[PDB]
Amino acid sequence: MKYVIGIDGGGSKTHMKISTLDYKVLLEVFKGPSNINSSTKEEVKRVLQELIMEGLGKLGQSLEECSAICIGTAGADRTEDKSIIEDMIRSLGYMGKIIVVNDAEIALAGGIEKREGIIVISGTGSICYGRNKEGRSARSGGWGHIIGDEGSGYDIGIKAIKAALKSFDKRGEKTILEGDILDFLKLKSHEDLINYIYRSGVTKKEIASLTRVVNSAYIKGDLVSKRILKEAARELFLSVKAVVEVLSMQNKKVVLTTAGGVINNINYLYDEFRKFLNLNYPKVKIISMKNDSAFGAVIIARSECD
């Protein structure tokens, strides 16, 4: 009757799996993404509570037989932030073990099924996290949508808008993004981007969705869009180079995987990223994720149980 909960607090959705102790996933639940750096504490708490309560309703059991909860979330990697998320879950009256980690850590667990390896996330945000054979971890990037997230979908979306505006106002190279962005957002004029960006409650996910427009334009031969994708791939490579160097893995066999809708969806960006790794770190073996991040959280939670 015992079970564990794994929660992926990702940049695109919050995703929960409830699993037996023999790794049979009984059910899953999806809610909107919720990050303490882009939502209020009260709003993040409400998302997490609704997520868990919905799953418990489908399960037909309370938290009493839940042996462990692992949440890997964007936005809460610092010691005080982990306490903030832990308190949100304790607010449900949960009495068991709570493991708070970052979203890269659960992507590593789910993707590689081991403690050692490197993960790059590029979805709404971006980060690189790794752990070497010595068990030491490092991260680069991951500084959020204002002071970081280079090479993320949010960054690509902002850069697409800026390129469209420079095309329109004559500061930059002509690009079909000029009109394609307006068409995607159903806006008549570039002036309408002001109300859209500053006065409509636009979300990070909505901005990141413009990556689709950049990919479509690249496939139509647009040179500015190709450059945006190439530069994003380079930023993601730099995040790997930093972690590899910090962890002393420049000359060592390492397994690397990738998570998020930017790095995993765009053929050209993925290929450029892989080309950088294959040339500079040929002993890095690149694989696809064996399981999703929510299952990685299940692994972390269940592994702490007898």
Ligand X SMILES: CC(=O)N[C@@H]1[C@@H](O[C@H](C)C(=O)O)[C@H](O)[C@@H](CO)O[C@H]1O
Q: Which residues are annotated as a binding site?
A: 12, 35, 124, 142-144, 149, 208
Annotate each residue in 100-139 with x if it binds ligand X (CB under 6 A) or - if it does not, as one string. Answer: --xxx----------------x-x-xxx------------
Kindly state whether residue 257 participates in binding ligand X, applying the rule CB under 6 A: no
Residue closest to ligand X (Cβ): 125
Mind giving me the DSSP string for 40-57? -HHHHHHHHHHHHHHHHH
Query: What is the nearest approach in angstroms of ligand X to the Cβ of residue 262?
Result: 11
Kindly state whether residue 74 participates in binding ligand X, applying the rule CB under 6 A: yes
Mind giving me the DSSP string for 117-165? EEEEEESSSEEEEEE-TTS-EEEEE--HHHH--TTSHHHHHHHHHHHHH
Q: What are the structure tokens assigned to 134, written together? A: 């010595």
Contact residue for ligand X among 26, 27, 32, 37 (CB under 6 A): 37
Q: 6 pairs with which residues across the strands?
A: 17, 70
Q: What is the largest CA-CA distance in the chain?
A: 65
How far, in Å, are 38, 48, 204 from residue 146 at the CA level?
A: 10, 24, 11
Query: What is the nearest approach in angstroms of ligand X to the Cβ of residue 37?
Result: 4
Kindly state whether residue 77 participates in binding ligand X, applying the rule CB under 6 A: yes
How far, in Å, are 66, 213, 299 from residue 61 at the CA level?
A: 9, 44, 21
Rounded CA-CA distance 299/222 in Å is 43
Give the interface segment with ligand X, choosing from 16-24, 61-69, 141-149, 276-284 (CB under 6 A).
141-149
Nearer to ligand X, 149 or 178 (CB): 149
Query: Which residues does the annotation place in the binding site for ATP?
Result: 12, 124, 208
Q: Are 207 and 158 in contact (CB under 8 A)?
A: yes
Contact residue for ligand X among 144, 153, 261, 296 (CB under 6 A): 144
For the chain, how big is the Rg over CA atoms in Å?
Answer: 20
Instruction: State the angle between helix axes of 177-185 and 153-169 in degrees (0 to 180), rounded to the nearest 10.
Output: 120
Contact residue for ligand X among 11, 151, 153, 261 (CB under 6 A): 11
Q: Which helix (H) or strand (E) segment is 273 a member of?
A: helix 267-280
Query: What is the nearest approach in angstroms of ligand X to the Cβ of residue 77?
Result: 4
CB within 8 Å of 113: residues ≥ 6 apart: 290, 291, 299
Query: What is the nearest approach in angstroms of ligand X to the Cβ of residue 118?
Result: 14
Give the interface segment with ligand X, choosing from 140-148, 158-166, 233-241, 261-269 (CB under 6 A).
140-148
Amino acid at 281: Y
Kindly state whether residue 149 participates in binding ligand X, applying the rule CB under 6 A: yes
Contact residue for ligand X among 7, 29, 71, 76 (CB under 6 A): 76
Contact residue for ligand X among 31, 82, 145, 205 (CB under 6 A): 145
Q: Kindly list the residues in this chain that would bind ligand X in the complex (CB under 6 A).
A: 11, 35, 37, 74-77, 102-104, 121, 123, 125-127, 142-145, 149
